[PDB]
Design a protein around this nucleic acid. Structure first.
Lengths: 23, 507, 255, 32, 32
DNA sequence: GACTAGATCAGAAGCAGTAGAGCATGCATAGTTT
């Protein structure tokens, strides 16, 4: 179960918000 | 998943943990304290009902129910708060290290069996239901017991017993002058030994970066708003559950406090007669409405009964092609409809058949929706939603139905009539070039609410008495400089090609 | 022992050797109302640390912030001590108007004398500013020294005597610096003692010092003829005697 | 030594200027 | 160098006190 | 018998979410008076 949130078990970890990144 | 998650922070108090390899570097003890503080703050913001504990081993003093030696349980399992964060803050710096040494001490021996026994005892004391039991080991000694093998065997047996009980064990190995090697002793104690976690690590574990990443967004466990009945007709009924995959986030409600002693107050509302002074309950008074130069009096019960149309649930009406559905007819956030086999047996099969056939024929089920009793019905469309997974097989789109509300005739507003002016192909081409220049990929979790983040930061600063609040970077503000650099001269050409010489858009 | 009578105090001090509970208990046993937040009735809020709450109170000009030392002094003397900018962190507009009458904008008064410690406290608040330039500061210092019979200082005994040294082979040339042993340090000492040393021989020169090299005497005697004012040639014994005696010696005995 | 002397004299001239301004204001008020 | 600073402080004190005494005398005259 | 201690059920509290009303604030739009 990779990506699981260590702080909150049972919830998928959320990546930091990157806003807008132009291609 | 029902209950609360409990976590214990075991921190080694050995001498080797207080030595810094380089002058401009953080000692392992300070890193562990920072990680604990970050987890505390994240838990306070997200899940305030969870339990946390902090235990030290290898110290000179002791504090535990069983009265073992060299084990000081600094904080037992309790809901997180500002007091515990402040208490931990007094060990962050070098002066904090001296204070910790004076209070408890360092450089003493220890036995892992006693540590695990104390952790199990702490877990047993809690009376609430605990869905998860977890222990984290912040240490940089891959061979805690190299001289004695009986102690290692006892520690192995205790770790196995804890694993059987259902207690997860994690190793947050820290930097070592020589290099951490899990294969020596910790392969067995650790609950899961990853294949990649067998080489000698020359740097702190990658999990510390995740721990230090503060999460300031509330986490809500799965729950069903309603468990209703889908009625294909009067005698075919299935049971479904409704969920809100998207829900607006609001600041926690304010509380009214007394100025003098910050003691919470209670607010009461009452209604009294002007000419008599007596108190009237909400049944003596009637209701009124002035229509046609006349007064119409209705009782409260009748006013409530005005809204009774049909029993709660969803009633099938037909199937409509998805093309007729319109994107700009949005009226309310959509909901998710899933089978519920507990109430009715056989609902899942019919639901799956309906979903499969709706996907095959590209149709949506038009239904009449009544969430609760005495609520006027609405017209909704259930659009099939297939199961979509990402590269790592983690589900990203669950299977079920998407309930979208449909506007009535009163929900639409007439628009002023405006003449249409069409742009020439050259202008459209220039605008296409600009749009292509300003292209980017969009994700649902690429933005954060500045108001909520600033509120949380201010609340933390006030609670912890920090010098100044932490400022949150706003990702919703346009990047004017980057856009100007990327566009180049296109803006000038577009303005020349679309605007007269003297227009002054700002004015 | 009830000095206070129906007075409201709010305390928010953080990191201090006298934490909040002791001050709150003392205030309670001194007949003083204690509140956790300020209000229209409270007449002071005490805080020994610059936390966020005191900053917010400062940004709202409706209250007075006082350091804990004021209440400690009040306890010590068993009497109500009048406030002072020394025991203060911020002032509401009314207190600003009140203190603007008998207290200058800085932390000084014009009704009560001052001592060494008080003047040090006043100077501590003042911050360094660079609105001046060397020559004008020197001129103002000279005028101040002349005004109040202020020319008797030993370290300012060469304020009005600018001295030019013959440490350069070619006059008005900075690339001809010599390696004089006694001359260089003597010039440095003269500068340290208040005298003004100029590397370029200009019209402002007043005194000239020449070492044991007598070959340059003719050059200086020729140069001074064209100058509107003629300087004086002195030997090394003059400066040494002046420093030893701590008072200026007559140049007539050292011309 | 030079830096210390200049700093102290600057502080003193500022304070004396404030005092002289107060004296002048008081004299102007007393003129009434 | 060490005694320089104390000399300067004691020096400023007297003149500042004289100015404050002048202020006191002017206020006493204005008391009328 | 009695006590003590284990395990089972049902009601109440907490919490989430919705709906109704009011208030305040800001702004815009149009009618009346001079």
């Amino acid at each position: 179960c990779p990506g699981e949130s260590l702080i909150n078990p049972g919830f998928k970890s959320k990546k930091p918000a990157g806003g807008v990144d132009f291609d | 998943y029902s209950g609360r998650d409990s976590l214990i922070f075991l921190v080694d108090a050995s001498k080797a943990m207080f030595e810094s390899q380089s002058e401009d570097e953080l000692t392992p003890f300070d890193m562990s304290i920072q990680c604990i503080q970050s987890v505390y703050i994240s838990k306070i913001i997200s899940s305030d009902r969870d339990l946390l504990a902090v235990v030290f081993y290898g110290t000179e003093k002791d504090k535990n129910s069983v009265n073992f030696k060299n084990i000081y349980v600094l904080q037992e399992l309790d809901n997180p708060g500002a007091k515990r964060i402040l208490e931990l803050d007094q060990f962050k710096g070098q002066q904090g290290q001296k204070r910790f040494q004076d209070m408890m001490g360092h450089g003493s021996d220890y036995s892992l069996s006693e540590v695990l026994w104390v952790c199990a005892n702490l877990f047993s004391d809690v009376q609430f239901k605990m869905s998860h039991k977890r222990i984290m080991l912040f240490t940089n000694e891959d061979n805690p017991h190299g001289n004695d093998s009986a102690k290692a065997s006892r520690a192995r047996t205790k770790a196995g017993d804890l694993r059987d009980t259902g207690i997860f064990l994690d190793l947050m190995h820290l930097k070592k002058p020589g290099g951490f090697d899990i294969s020596l002793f910790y392969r067995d104690i650790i609950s899961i030994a990853e294949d990649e976690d067998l080489r000698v690590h020359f740097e702190e574990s990658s999990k510390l970066e995740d721990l230090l990443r503060k999460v300031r967004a509330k986490e809500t466990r799965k729950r069903a708003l309603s468990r209703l009945k889908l009625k294909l007709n009067k005698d075919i009924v299935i049971s479904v559950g409704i969920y809100n995959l998207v829900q607006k986030a609001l600041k926690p409600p304010p509380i009214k406090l007394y100025r003098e002693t910050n003691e919470p107050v209670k607010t009461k509302t009452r209604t009294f007669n002007t000419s008599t002074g007596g108190l009237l309950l909400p049944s003596d008074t009637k209701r009124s409405q002035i229509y046609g130069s006349r007064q119409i009096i209705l009782e409260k019960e009748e006013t409530e009964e005005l809204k009774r149309f049909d029993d709660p649930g969803l009633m099938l009406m037909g199937f409509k092609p998805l093309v007729l559905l319109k994107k700009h007819h949005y009226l309310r956030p959509s909901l998710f409809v899933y089978p519920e086999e507990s109430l009715v047996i056989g609902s899942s099969t019919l639901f799956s058949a309906l979903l499969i056939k709706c996907l095959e024929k590209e149709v949506a089920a038009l239904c009449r929706y009544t969430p609760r009793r005495n609520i006027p019905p609405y017209f909704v469309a259930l659009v099939p939603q297939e199961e979509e997974l990402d590269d790592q097989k983690i589900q990203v789109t669950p299977p079920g139905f998407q309930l979208v509300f449909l506007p009535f005739a009163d929900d639409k507003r007439k628009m002023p009539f405006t003449e249409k002016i069409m742009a020439t192909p050259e202008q459209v081409g220039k605008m296409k070039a600009i749009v292509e220049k300003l292209r980017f990929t969009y994700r649902s979790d690429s933005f954060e609410n500045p108001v909520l983040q600033q509120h949380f930061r201010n609340l933390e600063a006030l609670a912890l008495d920090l010098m100044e609040p932490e400022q949150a970077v706003d990702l919703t503000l346009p990047k004017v400089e980057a856009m100007n650099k990327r566009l180049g001269s296109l803006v000038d050409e577009f303005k020349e090609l679309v605007y007269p010489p003297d227009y002054n858009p700002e004015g | 022992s009830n000095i206070f009578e129906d007075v409201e105090f709010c305390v928010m001090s953080g990191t201090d050797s006298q934490p909040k509970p002791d001050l709150e208990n003392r205030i309670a046993e001194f007949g003083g109302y204690i509140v956790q937040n300020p209000g229209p009735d409270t007449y002071c809020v005490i805080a020994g640390s610059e936390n966020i709450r005191v900053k917010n109170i400062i940004l709202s000009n409706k209250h007075d912030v006082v350091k804990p030392a004021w209440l400690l002094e009040c306890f010590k003397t068993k009497s109500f001590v009048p406030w002072q900018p020394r025991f203060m962190i911020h002032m509401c507009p009314s207190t600003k108007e009140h203190f603007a009458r008998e207290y200058d904008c800085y932390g000084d008064s014009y009704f009560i004398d001052t001592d060494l410690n008080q003047l040090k406290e006043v100077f501590s608040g003042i911050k360094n500013s660079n609105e001046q330039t060397p020559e004008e500061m020197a001129s103002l210092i000279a005028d101040l020294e002349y005004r109040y019979s202020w020319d008797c200082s030993p370290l300012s005994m060469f304020r009005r005597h600018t001295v030019y040294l013959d440490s350069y082979a070619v006059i008005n040339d900075l690339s001809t610096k010599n390696e004089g042993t006694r001359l260089a340090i003597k010039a440095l000492e003269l500068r340290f003692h208040g005298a003004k040393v100029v590397s370029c021989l200009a019209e402002g020169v007043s005194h000239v010092i020449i070492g044991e090299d007598h070959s340059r005497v003719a050059d200086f005697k020729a140069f001074r003829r064209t100058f509107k004012r003629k300087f004086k040639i002195l030997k090394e014994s003059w400066v040494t005697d002046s420093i030893d005696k701590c008072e200026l010696q007559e140049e007539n005995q050292y011309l | 030594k030079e830096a210390l002397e200049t700093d102290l004299y600057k502080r003193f001239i500022l304070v004396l200027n404030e005092k002289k301004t107060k004296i002048r204001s008081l004299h102007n008020k007393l003129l009434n």
